[PDB]
Design an enzyme around this catalytic site. Sequence first.
Site, PDB file in Angstrom:
ATOM      1  N   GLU A 109      52.381  40.993  53.202  1.00  0.00           N
ATOM      2  CA  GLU A 109      53.223  41.076  52.005  1.00  0.00           C
ATOM      3  C   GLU A 109      54.611  40.471  52.252  1.00  0.00           C
ATOM      4  O   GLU A 109      55.163  39.802  51.392  1.00  0.00           O
ATOM      5  CB  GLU A 109      53.383  42.503  51.481  1.00  0.00           C
TER       6      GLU A 109
ATOM      7  N   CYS B 176      47.735  33.037  35.621  1.00  0.00           N
ATOM      8  CA  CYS B 176      48.896  33.199  34.755  1.00  0.00           C
ATOM      9  C   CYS B 176      50.121  32.576  35.425  1.00  0.00           C
ATOM     10  O   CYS B 176      51.066  33.277  35.801  1.00  0.00           O
ATOM     11  CB  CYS B 176      49.143  34.669  34.408  1.00  0.00           C
TER      12      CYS B 176
ATOM     13  N   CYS C  91      41.452  33.525  31.730  1.00  0.00           N
ATOM     14  CA  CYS C  91      42.096  34.806  31.999  1.00  0.00           C
ATOM     15  C   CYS C  91      41.362  35.988  31.383  1.00  0.00           C
ATOM     16  O   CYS C  91      41.034  35.929  30.188  1.00  0.00           O
ATOM     17  CB  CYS C  91      43.556  34.787  31.471  1.00  0.00           C
TER      18      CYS C  91
END
Lengths: 225, 225
Positions: A37, A192, A202
């Site tokens: 992360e 997106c 999507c």
Amino acid sequence: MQASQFSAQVLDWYDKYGRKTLPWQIDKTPYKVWLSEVMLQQTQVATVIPYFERFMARFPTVTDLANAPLDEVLHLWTGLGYYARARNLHKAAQQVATLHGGKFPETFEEVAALPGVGRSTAGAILSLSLGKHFPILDGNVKRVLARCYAVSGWPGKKEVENKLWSLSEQVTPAVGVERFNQAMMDLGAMICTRSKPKCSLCPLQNGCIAAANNSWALYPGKKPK
Amino acid sequence: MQASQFSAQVLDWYDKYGRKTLPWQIDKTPYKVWLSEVMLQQTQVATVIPYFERFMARFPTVTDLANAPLDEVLHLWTGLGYYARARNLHKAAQQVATLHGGKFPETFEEVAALPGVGRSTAGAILSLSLGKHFPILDGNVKRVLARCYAVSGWPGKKEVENKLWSLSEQVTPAVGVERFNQAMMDLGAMICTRSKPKCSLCPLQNGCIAAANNSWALYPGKKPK
Ligand code: SF4
Ligand code: SF4
């Protein structure tokens, strides 16, 4: 679109289009997810992957990372940019070695207290590695929720950020949270997109306000001035 | 650039930029590599990954694939296009079950005899899964070698194809062949692209004739008429 429909749609999409073969998705642990992360937050995945692998090989555990000289950490970081991340990474590892017995903490407050780790990164670490029921809100997620729900404001404003956290909390399930939260980041990163989102690809397209009005450019709000 | 320098440069690049976390690179076997090669030959990696995973889950071994009804195979293939690949896949699995005891063959002539498998796919299967010393020559490799070595001709001509195989043989090492052959496909797919190759990111840039003359558009030759 009811919130239960939102997460059902996202989980169905992830099942058929997701991939969970990134190196921090194999044999997941809090340490691996944290490391990935931090690297990903200002670096694109394609670039992170070889760095992640080198860091896991050199530092198989958070205690190895903590005991290494900072200069070696910075040298291995070379090329990732945004080195305050590397300096906070090493401090956080040291705080895990010192305060938590070298066991990366598995409760939210202790994770969130680490240098370099905010509320979203803490919920990401624990949801993705242990299935704990925390929502996330990185740039990918902010863009998906702001478009779906027409959040016009700049997320740099506290009330707008708060509105986005409330929406994230509302759509984030407990069951399947690890898949849902990975899927939301994958959607924000690949579908997106900041520019010209691929709405036909999507799973939210049937309920998304931005898609309905072709108004994705309005959301999220950009920095006013 | 001597051929030993070519493969050294490519192997050094792969070490620092390669990734070997695709699902057909984890716990590699002849079956997994074959399946992935067939899927990839007319489909982009991003699209193949979820199909690969579904096929490995449904068909953990080549005998499971062989014993499945063809209609189920075609139904799982749906969306990959070029279904002659799926029909040859199933025939090949059946030939492995029937002739090779359900053990995917590990010698070149038996692999190359399977439906849907040519010389390059056979060398890919055995080099990538077992480290056997075979060169490869898919579209990615053809573009890298034709640019580096200024092969002007159309590879649809037998003599040009032969020249490309000879170059591939010349640069392909035995030591590290599995890494070299994966690296050549990755280079051709991501760096030495059909359009506007990224030569500054290429480990061959110092010896490549196309890079020297900015003449990548000439190589390989296109179909004359
Ligand atoms: S439908 Fe379009 S704008 Fe709406 S969330 Fe999906 S990709 Fe984004
Ligand atoms: S230097 Fe450029 S043209 Fe030459 S092999 Fe590399 S990417 Fe291709």
